[PDB]
Amino acid sequence: KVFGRCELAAAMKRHGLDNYRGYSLGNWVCAAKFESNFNTQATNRNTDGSTDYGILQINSRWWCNDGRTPGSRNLCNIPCSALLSSDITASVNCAKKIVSDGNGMNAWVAWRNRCKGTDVQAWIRGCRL
Ligand SMILES: [Cl-]
Ligand SMILES: [Cl-]
Ligand SMILES: [Cl-]
Ligand code: NA
């Protein structure tokens, strides 16, 4: 599924991400924009042979099982395929674990490089929330 901007903001809010670990909704929308372009089916292979999945490009190195990332963990206890669903529940639940692990949203290098410090409220500007 390719979400609209305000559509995704709504679904994130309903799943409890707004202000989760102190990160306003716009942070989460900005990260999804630059990670996936709001496409739940987004995948990207990393140099180490792990893969990033879904709207928030969650990595098989630590967070999900894809059967093809040697030595990896599955800390969200899900198949990585679950992160590709039109329903964002698994991605949001796993993102909450990730952002709680010590580094906040810096886990998402794209958030650090393209969202952190910017006017992230622009990402939810105009949305009925
Ligand atoms: Cl915001
Ligand atoms: Cl594996
Ligand atoms: Cl933090
Ligand atoms: Na894994």
From Swiss-Prot:
In the egg white and polymorphonuclear leukocytes. It catalyses: Hydrolysis of (1->4)-beta-linkages between N-acetylmuramic acid and N-acetyl-D-glucosamine residues in a peptidoglycan and between N-acetyl-D-glucosamine residues in chitodextrins. GO terms for cellular component: cytoplasm; endoplasmic reticulum; extracellular space. It is found in: Secreted. The active site is at E35, D52. Belongs to the glycosyl hydrolase 22 family. Lysozyme C is capable of both hydrolysis and transglycosylation; it also shows a slight esterase activity. It acts rapidly on both peptide-substituted and unsubstituted peptidoglycan, and slowly on chitin oligosaccharides. This is Lysozyme C. It comes from Gallus gallus (Chicken). The lineage of its organism: Eukaryota, Metazoa, Chordata, Craniata, Vertebrata. The gene is LYZ.
